[PDB]
């Protein structure tokens, strides 16, 4: 059977086509040691991937090999792809068709390099690479719609008709998980605190998951922040510092809607939906609006879907019939979409064989 | 001497009669500041146009008043001219007879309204409006010839038999040089290519000009882009990223022959030439077949004349004299046709006088 | 028991006999899939008829099997009827007598081949084929007159006196429901609009039915268009672009009186009536001038009967009584007549059975 492997900028999820829910789920980090010391009962080790990269981070420096949707470094990608099979999944590549995911609408060479390294270094009998937002539409179990796939690096509004994007409206904005934590980090220093290590930047990254939320209306939320302590939510910062976070808790995740808040020349996410759709053919738009679907990391925020209903309806003509879906499982949607499609009998023919590599070469798809 | 200001949907060119090269060529963008302020540099003036407005996006909200060579906003079109006269050419409208252009099959009122503003707010001593294809044909030194503009704005085929357009086959495709840059801006994304801000989208426009070509046979080509990096040409993005560009090099221009890849079941430029020619009378058809003149910016792509020559040969009888003629200057022919027409001595009695304007009014054209 | 199934340039109308209004109703379209993929619900498919095809129109190749009321392909047609019995009426053709309709100039071959398909494949027990305009006269209940049959594909003048339709007096004029809608496309796009996608492609059809007028006195209604009265009629798209249709609204039905509006240098319906009544005998004439019956989808226009009233009255002898009988039901009359006829207590011994069919062969029917 086959393996599906969502390479995030920050999270890499993998498993056997057949199950509902992914097996290997690890941070996309390659760490590297900061001093010649011996690990307790190990060789010194040149690098650390995912999880042991995460725990041994302090004595380390951590690079992520995927930034903003791009695989940037290609060795550190191999270390991730290795850490899947030979560490997380307990498998040998040549046993398995493998599938990986990519950022709405491809050319060639970065996929060539993906396809290449698969069949050569690892020797997987088959590969397929399939679209990240479009696979969230496959997870949502429909054809048409507009996805907002926003992970660590890169958000995407993707409008779709048939299985594919109506791609001319796929706005990127590289305003996403990373710079959202950078805001929380600043607005807590502003609040009177400090943070130094990347571990501490994880603890920031973390308060983002647990305490940062999306109001239905910012202006009334700033008002209720100014009225009652109600919004303040403390948390024991591991050391000790039970810190209070109040108006910040929305003033960070807001950043999708206001890049002005970090100080960037982008219009907000709420508007980019309308503009992507206005860029598209005009009547099928109705279907697109009716299936606005969300996915990834930064889409996990408490309130974001109902607020997208306030916002996008005020942008669009009132009779528009807009409907935002955002799967409860959404961190894994690209993989749910993946497992099922990889396991699909009418799609079994579409996989890239080993054979097609050895004859036709890396730019197969 | 008498001016020529061709109102490109994205590219406006000005100048006079007689000049060989267009004197004032600029991005036809009206820019207004997002918070108009008290001082210099701070966004001071209620409208900018051209390369100034272009860099100043960061302070502005940009507009294109002309959509599909149909001026869809006059209150912005005017103020472009007020910059084109006073800030580009640095001259006063009331002194020079003006020649300005139109997209074929212009709704008469819109012409009459250009005619209105020119003589009323602009008080120009004389004026004449002119059809874009028909001027580009004059910049080949022809009377007769079916012409096909593909500009930034809109793509237009005209059976110009002997200096007259035959309306009934003046065909339009609303997928064009803008939507082609867009066609590229779709299909670079899963190599992590970042095109999403207007700055980035500019960069994808540059790649379209520099690398994108019409393959002589689409499918064969694809398999050479698979088999070899023969197609694969690298490019350094303004930050410094050595990217490589391959399939998109031939896939991006090909939306002109297959509108479908954008999402418009419209006939390709070739099919549309043919279908315009048949829609003319039998004897008109012969010369049109042998005198297909290409015009605009989007007719520049390497491959396009040889490819049009191939396909129209399949489409016409074996013994039919198919013959393409393309100007190396085709992004500017429409302007050159202006400058030639204004300088034509014969034509000095053909201008619309200020007299006729005030005796007979806007409707006379 | 008996069935009636009217085959149109636009729509099939099927049912049983003696039902008031058609049981099955579907667009004469036959689509083929352009993409080898599973429409998850079906397996692989052959072809799509009706609204199966009018849903999947983008991914299909649509074909019009019955150009202008003449059966133009028998492959697609056999499938239409294969769809008619089983899927729509949900029953088996072999226990059901089946009346169908035919064109006023319909060749023997077309009558005989529809009947070959009828018995020899579907195995129906008894069938009838009957001339479209007569069946409107039979829904109008009379034996005599001149029947102005304008549907989607064809406009007709069929005189009848006693039962049977008059072959050399039947006028036909191939400009009708389609030619009018896609004209309303041009004049309204000309009014500064564009029906770019599928459902406003549908809205140019919708507007034509609901909103349009055969204004009585068009000339002094052109004055009323030009002096601007509140004749203007907004309607919304699927988005919130309220489109304002005012004048064109009547300037499009105007084509059934002057064929010049599209481009045919020929006499409008009104005249062609008068001409057929000339070509008809003298003694009949007083009937024809007073039993001018109109039907087919296109005759539904607000004002068309009054207008026809005046047009032929301005051509006839003033000693003559004139009457254009436009029934409130006219878009289904061709079937109502059929249904009534099949349900007639006298018609059973004209139910042409397989016994009659076999022994005589196709030429019995």
Q: Whose CA is closest to A349, among C122, B239, C37?
A: C37
Nearest CB to A105; choose among B187, B227, B262: B187
Alpha-carbon gap, residue A62 to A49, rounded angstroms: 9
The C-alpha atoms of residue A60 and residue B12 are separated, in whole angstroms, by 56
**What is the bridge-based pairing of β-strands C30-33 and C48-49?**
antiparallel
Beta partners for residue A14, in sequence order:
A5, A24
Is residue A318 less than 8 Å (CB to CB) from chain C? Answer: yes
* Contact by Cβ (8 Å): A283, C199: yes
- Nearest chain B CA: its distance from C129 CA (Å): 38
Q: Does B168 touch chain C (CB under 8 A)?
A: yes
The answer to whether residues B284 and B161 touch, using CB atoms and an 8 Å cutoff, is yes
Show Cβ contacts of residue A323 under 8 Å, excluding neighbours closer than 6 positions: A289, A290, A291, A292
Residue A244 touches partner B, C-beta closer than 8 Å: no
Using the Cβ of B190 and the Cβ atoms of chain C, whether some distance falls under 8 Å is answered with no
Which tokens go with A114?
């993906």
Asked if A282 has any chain C CB less than 8 Å from its own CB, the reply is: yes
Asked if residue C137 lies in contact with residue C145, where contact means CB atoms within 8 angstroms, the answer is yes
Whole-angstrom CA distances from B12 to B23, B81, B118 are 11, 10, 16
A282 closest CB neighbour out of C38, C196, C236? C196
Inspect the interface and report whether the beta carbons of C198 and A319 lie closer than 8 Å: no
Q: How many residues does chain C have?
A: 365
Q: Are B151 and B298 in contact (CB under 8 A)?
A: yes
Verify whether the Cβ–Cβ distance A70 to B192 is below 8 Å. yes
Among A91, A92, A93, A111, residue whose Cα is nearest residue A101: A111
Question: For residue B141, is it left (φ>0), alpha (ψ between -120 and 50) or beta?
Answer: left
- Partners of C265 on chain B (C-beta within 8 Å) are none
Q: Which residues contact A143 (CB under 8 A, 6 or more apart)?
A: A137, A160, A161, A162, A163
Q: Which residues contact B200 (CB under 8 A, 6 or more apart)?
A: B194
Size of interface A-C (CB pairs under 8 A): 45
Which of A267, A250, A270, A256 is closest to A322 using CA atoms? Answer: A270
Resolution of the experimental model in angstroms, please? Answer: 9.5
Question: Does residue A62 sit in helix, strand or coil?
Answer: strand
Q: Does C190 touch chain B (CB under 8 A)?
A: yes
- Is the sign of the CA dihedral C94, C99, C102, C108 positive or negative? positive
Probe site for chain C from B107, B110, B179, B280 (most C CB atoms < 10 A): B107
The helix (run of H) or strand (run of E) holding residue A244 is strand A242-245
Question: In this structure, are residues B7 and B66 in contact, taking their beta carbons and an 8 Å threshold?
Answer: yes
A317/C239 Cβ within 8 A: yes
B chain contacts of residue C261, beta-carbon cutoff 8 Å: none
In whole angstroms, give the CA distance from residue C343 to residue C336. Answer: 10
* Three-state SS annotation for C69-130: HCCCCHHHHHHHHHHHHHHHCCCCHHHCCEEEEECCCCCHHHHHHHHHHHHHCCCCCEEEEE
CA distance A70 to chain B (A): 4
* Cβ contact C263–B174 (<8 Å): no
How many other C-beta atoms lie within 10 A of the C-beta of residue C182? 14
Tell me which residue has tokens 């699927």: C238
Q: Are A319 and C240 an interchain contact pair (Cβ–Cβ within 8 Å)?
A: yes
Contact across the interface for B107 and C190, Cβ inside 8 Å? yes
CA R_g for chain A? 21
Residue contact C240–A282, C-beta within 8 A: no
Range list of H helices, A173-325? 177-190, 198-211, 218-227, 248-251, 269-279, 285-290, 304-315
C38 inside 8 A of chain A by CB? yes
A316 and C240: CB-CB below 8 Å? Answer: yes
- In this complex, the residue of C35, C58, C197 whose CB is nearest that of residue A282 is C197
Nearest to C212 by CA among C237, C238, C188: C188
- A97-102 vs A126-131, strand pairing mode: parallel
Phi, psi (degrees; rounded to nearest 5) at C225: -75, -40
- CB-based contact (8 Å) between B19 and chain C? no
Q: Among C34, C190, C193, pick the best mutation site for testing chain B contact (most B Cβ within 10 A).
A: C190
Q: Looking at chain A, list the stretches that DSSP marks H as alpha helix, in order from N- to C-terminal side.
A: 50-55, 75-83, 109-117, 132-140, 177-190, 198-211, 218-227, 248-251, 269-279, 285-290, 304-315, 333-342, 354-360
Distance CA A271, CA A155 (A): 14
Method for structure elucidation: cryo-EM
Query: What b/e sequence results for C191-206 when a residue is b if at least 16 CB atoms lie within 10 Å of its CB, and e otherwise?
Result: eebebebbbbbebbbe
Residues B53, B44 contacting (CB under 8 angstroms) = no
Structure tokens at C209: 């039915």
| Listed residue (B253, B232, B251, B258) closest to B243, CA to CA | B232
- Residue A364: count of CB within 10 angstroms of its CB: 20
Cα separations in angstroms, A48 against A26, A31, A52, C287: 12, 5, 6, 99
- Cα separation, B145 vs B290, in Å, equals 8
d(CA B272, CA B229): 33
> What pairs with residue C160 in β-bridges?
C145, C165
- Residue environment code for B106-143, b if the CB has 16+ CB neighbours within 10 A, otherwise e: beeebbbebbbbbbeebebbbbbbbbbbbbbbbbbebe
- Buried b / exposed e across C310-335, counting CB within 10 Å, b at 16+? ebbbebeeeeeebebbbbeebbbbbb
Is residue A95 helix, strand or coil?
helix
Q: And the tokens for A123?
A: 């020797």
B183 and A168 in contact by Cβ < 8 A? yes
Cβ pair B237, B221 in contact under 8 A: no
Question: What is the nearest CA distance from B260 to chain C, expressed in angstroms?
Answer: 10
Token readout for A360 is 């036709």
Distance from the Cα of C48 to chain B's closest Cα (Å) equals 19
Chain C's closest residue to B71, CA to CA, is C192
A140: which residues sit within 8 A by CB, 6+ positions away? Answer: A291, A293, A325, A327, A333, A337
At which residue do the structure tokens 């001018």 appear? Answer: C292
A260 touches chain B (CB under 8 A): no
Q: Are B276 and B146 spatial neighbours (Cβ–Cβ below 8 Å)? A: yes
Q: Name, in order, each residue with C-beta under 8 angstroms of B23's C-beta and a sequence gap of 6 or more.
A: B13, B14, B15, B16, B88, B89
Asked if C37 has any chain A CB less than 8 Å from its own CB, the reply is yes
- Which of C56, C32, C29 has its CA nearest to residue C44? C32
* B169 in Cβ contact with B276 (< 8 Å): yes
The dihedrals phi and psi of B128, each to the nearest 5 degrees, come to: -165, 135
CB B150 within 8 A of CB B133: no
d(CA C107, CA C71): 10
Per the CB < 8 Å rule, is C197 touching A285? yes
Which chains form contacts with chain B, at 3 or more CB pairs under 8 Å? A, C
Classified as helix, coil or strand, B42 is: coil
**Quick check: C317 contacting A, CB < 8 Å?**
no
DSSP class of residue B60 equals: E
Distance CA C138, CA C160 (A): 11
Residue B64: φ, ψ to 5°? -120, 105
Q: Three-class SS of residue A123?
A: coil
Residue B246: list chain A partners with CB under 8 A. Answer: 107-109, 363
Is the minimum CB–CB distance between C39 and chain A shorter than 8 Å?
Answer: no
Write the CA distances from B155 to B18, B69, B129, B148, integer angstroms: 27, 9, 19, 7
Report the 3 state secondary structure along chain C. Answer: CCEEEECCCCEEEEEECCCCCCCEEEECCEEEECCCCCCECECCCCCEECHHHHHHCCCEECCCCCHHHCCCCHHHHHHHHHHHHHHHCCCCHHHCCEEEEECCCCCHHHHHHHHHHHHHCCCCCEEEEEEHHHHHHHHCCCCEEEEEEECCCCEEEEEEECCCECCCCCEEECCCHHHHHHHHHHHHHHCCCCCCCHHHHHHHHHHHHHHCCCCCCCHHHHHHHHCCCCCCEEEECCCCCEEEECCHHHHCHHHHCCHHHCCCCCCCHHHHHHHHHHHCCCCCHHHHCCCEEEECHHHHCCCHHHHHHHHHHCCCCCCCCCCEECCCCCCCHHHHHHHHHHCCCCHHHHCEEHHHHHHHCHHHC
Both ends of chain B: CA-CA distance in Å?
Answer: 23
Buried-state track A23-45, b at ≥16 Cβ within 10 A, e below 16 = bbbbbbbbbebeeeeeeeeeeee
Which pair of tokens denotes residue B77? Answer: 């079109």
Q: Does the distance separating the beta carbons of B197 and A105 come in below 8 Å?
A: no
Q: What angle do CA B288, B292, B293 make, to 5 degrees?
A: 135
- C59 interfaces chain A, CB cutoff of 8 Å: yes
Reading the block at residue C321, the tokens are 């009584």
């Amino acid at each position: 059977t086959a393996l599906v492997c969502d390479n995030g900028s920050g999270l890499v999820k993998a498993g056997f086509a057949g199950d509902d829910a992914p097996r290997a789920v690890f941070p996309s980090i390659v760490g590297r040691p900061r001093h010649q010391g011996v690990m307790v009962g190990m060789g010194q080790k040149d690098s650390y991937v995912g999880d042991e990269a995460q725990s041994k981070r302090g004595i380390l420096t951590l690079k992520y090999p995927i930034e903003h949707g791009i695989i940037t470094n290609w060795d550190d990608m191999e270390k991730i792809w290795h850490h899947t099979f030979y560490n997380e999944l307990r498998v040998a590549p040549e046993e398995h068709p493998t599938l990986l995911t990519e950022a709405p609408l491809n050319p060639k060479a970065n996929r060539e390099k993906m396809t290449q390294i698969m069949f050569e270094t690892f020797n997987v009998p088959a590969m397929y690479v399939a679209i990240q937002a479009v696979l969230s539409l496959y997870a949502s179990g429909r054809t048409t719609g507009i996805v907002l796939d926003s992970g660590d690096g890169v958000t995407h509004n993707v409008p779709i008709y048939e299985g594919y994007a109506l791609p001319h409206a796929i706005m990127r904005l590289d305003l996403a998980g990373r710079d959202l934590t950078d805001y929380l980090m600043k607005i807590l220093t502003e609040r009177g605190y400090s943070f130094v290590t990347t571990a501490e930047r994880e603890i920031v990254r973390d308060i983002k998951e647990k305490l940062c939320y999306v109001a239905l209306d910012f202006e009334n939320e700033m008002a209720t922040a100014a009225s009652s302590s109600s919004l303040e939510k403390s948390y024991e910062l591991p050391d000790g510092q039970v810190i209070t976070i109040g108006n910040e808790r929305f003033r960070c995740p807001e950043t999708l809607f206001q890049p002005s808040f970090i100080g960037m020349e982008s219009a907000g996410i709420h508007e980019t939906t309308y503009n992507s759709i206005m860029k598209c053919d005009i009547d099928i738009r109705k279907d697109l609006y009716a299936n606005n679907v969300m996915s990834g990391g930064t889409t996990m925020y408490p309130g974001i879907a109902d607020r997208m209903q306030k916002e996008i309806t005020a942008l669009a003509p009132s009779t528009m019939k807009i409907k935002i879906i955002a799967p409860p499982e959404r961190k894994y949607s690209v993989w749910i979409g993946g497992s099922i499609l990889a396991s699909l009998s009418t799609f079994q023919q579409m996989w890239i064989t080993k054979q097609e590599y050895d004859e036709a070469g890396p730019s197969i798809v």
